């Protein structure tokens, strides 16, 4: 049910400079993601379960045949469950004890909020107790002169873990739970390595509540963008909204798509649920059932760890 992802080395998830609340003296061409997309995760598991007879043109049609419903992404350091949190061009990794008294804090007045968030992201964040943003600058060398080759330099800014840190997802299948368990996978970007392992793990799901947390990018159907933005605070409490890319298909080697998304770590309300489930049609109704099956619309209550999708 629960599948831990243990990175054996620093990872790279190619973000396109969406967020940068950080200095080193870096000036790096590729900023990294702190928590990866589920298309990385579903793409990694489908890179295990791949068959030649399951090759067709559309990726997510093929991808949902290869697996069951994948659930959201967070951190277990053997003793915590750390969860993302976005304030807008900022990110934190917090346990849920600072999430229980959080929908308390949301509706409150002027100075109570700045008392709250500036202790939360700045004194209660476990980001820089965990994450070491590590610049790596690589080159290319011509074999016939042994110098730098001209024009070929890059500066990729990776993601390292100070103490041992594992990723947490949930999958509903049980047949794959053996053949995924204990697999060394090419997880991430520039040829990095992680390790999957499977433990059966009881998890409660499906609680109805107003204020949720998004453990994955909540997708927006890209038709009611005017109907969404005009009351932006009607659907999200705090967080960040951005045009994301769904990634890169393997068999056809192109970019996948681009959608506006409610980024992970955003505190949303219940009013997004009927919004998506009354602004969908039969094409995208059959589309977006697959996106929850690879895990975009993961919603967690701040009462306890209880997951639910939008169409679930």
């Amino acid at each position: 049910k629960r599948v831990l992802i243990k990175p054996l080395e620093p990872l790279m998830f190619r973000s396109q400079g969406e967020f940068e609340p950080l200095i080193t003296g870096s000036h790096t061409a590729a900023q990294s993601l702190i928590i990866p997309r589920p298309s990385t995760i579903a793409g990694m598991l489908g890179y295990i379960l791949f068959n030649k007879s399951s090759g067709t043109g559309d990726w997510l049609s093929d991808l949902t045949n290869l697996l069951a419903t994948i659930y959201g992404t967070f951190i277990e350091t053997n003793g915590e469950y750390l969860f993302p949190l976005r304030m807008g061009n900022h990110l934190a990794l917090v346990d849920q004890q600072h999430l229980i008294n959080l929908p308390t804090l949301l509706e409150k007045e002027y100075e109570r909020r700045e008392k709250g968030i500036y202790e939360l992201f700045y004194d209660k964040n476990k980001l820089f107790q965990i994450i070491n943003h590590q610049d790596r600058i690589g080159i290319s060398i011509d074999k016939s002169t042994r110098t730098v080759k001209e024009h070929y330099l890059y500066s990729a800014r990776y993601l390292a873990f100070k103490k041992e840190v594992n990723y947490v997802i949930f999958i509903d299948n049980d047949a794959i739970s053996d053949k995924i368990n204990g697999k060394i996978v090419n997880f991430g970007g520039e040829n990095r390595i992680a390790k999957l392992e499977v433990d059966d793990y009881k998890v409660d799901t499906s609680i109805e509540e107003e204020y949720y947390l998004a453990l994955s990018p909540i997708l927006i159907p890209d038709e009611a963008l005017d109907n969404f933005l005009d009351n932006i605070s009607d659907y999200v409490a705090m967080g960040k909204v951005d045009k994301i890319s769904l990634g890169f298909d393997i068999a056809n080697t192109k970019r996948k798509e681009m959608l506006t998304a409610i980024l992970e770590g955003s505190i949303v309300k219940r009013s997004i649920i009927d919004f998506i489930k009354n602004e969908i049609k039969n094409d995208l109704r059959y589309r977006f059932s697959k996106y929850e099956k690879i895990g975009y619309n993961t919603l967690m209550s701040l009462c306890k760890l209880a997951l639910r999708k939008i169409l679930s």
């Binding site: 969406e18 200095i23 003296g25 000036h27 807008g88 061009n89 002027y110 409490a237 909204v241």
Partner: protein, 1009 residues
Amino acid sequence: FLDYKIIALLHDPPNKAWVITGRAAKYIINQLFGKNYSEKVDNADKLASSIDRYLGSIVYKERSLFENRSIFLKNILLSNIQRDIGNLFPKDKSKLDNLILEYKKLLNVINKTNLILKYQLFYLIYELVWIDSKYENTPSDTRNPTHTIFDHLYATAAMMNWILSLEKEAKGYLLGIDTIGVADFISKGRKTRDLWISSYLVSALLWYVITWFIEEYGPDVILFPSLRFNQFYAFYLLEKLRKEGVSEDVIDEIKELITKYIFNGDDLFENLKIPPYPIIPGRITLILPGLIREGEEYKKVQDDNCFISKVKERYNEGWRKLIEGLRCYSERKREDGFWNLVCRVLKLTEDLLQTTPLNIRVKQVSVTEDEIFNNNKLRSDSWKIYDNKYRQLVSEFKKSKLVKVTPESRLKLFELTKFDKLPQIGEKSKRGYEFCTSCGVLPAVVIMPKEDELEKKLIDLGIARDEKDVRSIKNMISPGERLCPWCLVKRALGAEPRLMRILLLGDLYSVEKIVNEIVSRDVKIEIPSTSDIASIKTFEEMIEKKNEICEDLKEEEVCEKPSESVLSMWQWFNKNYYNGINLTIDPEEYWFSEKRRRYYFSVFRRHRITFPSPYYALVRADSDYLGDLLEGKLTPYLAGIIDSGDYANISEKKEEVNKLLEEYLVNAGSGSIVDYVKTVLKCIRENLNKCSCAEKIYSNEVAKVMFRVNVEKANVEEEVKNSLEYFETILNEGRIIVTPAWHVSISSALNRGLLVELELVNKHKGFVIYAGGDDLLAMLPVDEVLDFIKESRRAFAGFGTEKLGNMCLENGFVRINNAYYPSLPIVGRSYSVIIAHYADPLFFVINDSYNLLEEGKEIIRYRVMYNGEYKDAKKDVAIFRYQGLTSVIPLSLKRPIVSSVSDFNEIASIIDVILELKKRIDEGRISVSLLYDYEKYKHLIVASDEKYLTEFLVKDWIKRNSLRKHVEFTIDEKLYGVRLTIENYPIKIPNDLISNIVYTLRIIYGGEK
């Protein structure tokens, strides 16, 4: 009905310090009727200033209870600074009204039938015609001289928009607009050609939508920023008159009235024909009536949503008219090249570009007949709402700041990427589509080779119809770059930056009447490059050693003729371009190539000059605790002592805050009014908490009441109670009250702090990128940064020793030829200073200049001397960065910043010690290896505890590295107990200021190569 507000503005004479009870409404009106009141402009006077309940309501209108005929003047933020005006007033009693007739040199040669042309032309030149007869900026109230009169005059006509909106049944509005995110958009850019105009598209799109108001509601309608010294407003109003058709001799009564004060150089609003510098910040507020104009007369509609839909479409209406006039230029000049490419995409992508590349948060609050009127006049505490509505408005900004919806996210791109419906130019994407390289996220429509067979193979992909147009394509587009449609607008706008006079004028003309001016002209404009700024002292020495070192270079267009007309927005260039040296060149090929760069160093060594130094300097600033000062909080007085988050429970932090506003407001009075507040204020949890804690000060209050009898009563049980409820507010809540005159006073000093900072930077060799005024982003040469920072922080606080354009800069004030305009002395100014090699990727230099500063505003703490003991601060740091060598310098060393007149010359005098150390190393008096021998002394001075034994260890290190043995260097001993707290953040910062003195001069001499 409105736009007759001049009598609402001039409800008082502007000679108000020679009228109110002694020291000989002296004049009222000579071009309209008497002032509009039954209770209207009178309540508009009583809600405008905080003096109106400081001394009670009726004492503001009885105008003699504690009167004075010896007149001083104070600063609004800090009233420990007495300013004198004395015997002098604008002149004799029979020439007292010539200056009233000098209103009437244009405003009664043009007919008074319409009121949309008078009320706007009277606002801008109002101070400017009075200061030339030298009235010395008199206070509004003689008993409390803590408001300049124009800041009360412009307030009493600004909130007249609330008075004349409450006269249909009930309306009235505040409307604050903020853009979504500035600096990440500003950072997008690859040449500085984008960086300069991306600052401009912030200001000019926001300048567009605020012409929509002032052409329909008149000026004095935006509090924040003030339209009193806006350099955009002296070009917008300059073309309102030029549209009309008067003589250019007649406008010289207006134009060179403006010229010597605003736009101090010869590069004017009509030398390069645009404003040079983007000036409007991203955060603005409007005070608005409830009216809608149908032609000379106004109706209301009741629904609140009449603006937030119809403001944002005007913000769309700019971006539509910006890009469709931009379609015209590459259609008019389509045969010229590089514009064949821009006209091609604007024929393709007309789905994606109808959305703006920046968005704005428009939050809106209102006012009714309630809480301002009780039967039809004032109620008790009608002044408690105006700050609270500002606290309603900023809370709406505080609420919706937590969701930043990026402007890329508004496009509909799903079907364009699910199915290949992307139009492209150049190569076809093997990966479906290709990311933009100048925003970083968006797909590209330009796909260009880097090389392979450069100029040849670009043609057979569809970018070139000949060879010569590639040179213009290679001009602004470097090869290998791929651009989104939004940057391809901007890189086209950088080539013709004069094109935004469409947007800048608000389409004051037609759409074609604007653009056809610069259809004609071909004035080339230079933006300086990074190798320009790094090699200023190359051009500074080529001027001095003019041609005697330039004979082998008389073929290399460095000593050849300045050719076309080329003249910039950069003032150093703009008065030193015609010396015999062209400066339009991009010196990445002369002395920053590598083929003929060594040969040019063979020239410089036989003539013994200083080499080009490959490092410029980017300087950013920030206002420290600005908005909460404008909300009235006392954090910028005690920055780091008590931050804004401590305003939850002030009844435990009551120690120094109830000392702070206490000793300020009792320092705000003059004479017998000083005692009137110093016992009514203290009895809050001292006496038995009700009335008769302050009845004892009636015994000398009675000394003026039966004087000239006009008082309707013999009982005062109410003027020692409504004064008590005022200080019931501003003690049990630590906020100070925000009045209309509050914002007008600061924003006028912001606008004066703006233009003095534009003159300070090019008294050096500096260039302006963004200058909002409370924010700044400039690019100085590597040498002059420190004494800039020394004298920028001394100018923003307000302190001068050097004479600027025409303005004199005094302690806590600023004097323009008589008139002591105030300053912002207690409001600190952070800095982030990056030394950068010119070959950096400049997108990220603008990234870690904002990202350097935002962590400095939160973590950096230092032990600061408060009343003899060491308390801690958080702001007023000037962060340096060489490349990773980061150095943090505090600027204050006292809480608050200023408390007397002898304290001004020690603001940022920390870096004068740095400067005097730099002054004695480059001569050969203090040795160079001082800085390297320091790291032996650091481990003891850190471990030292009381500074008397530290005095020798400092002086030993100076003496040990000393080339002469009599050169003495005076180091302040209060620079010793300072230690820097920077927790939980991975950068390496030293924990004492002396190491950061040493690491600052490691950077600067590291900057000079």
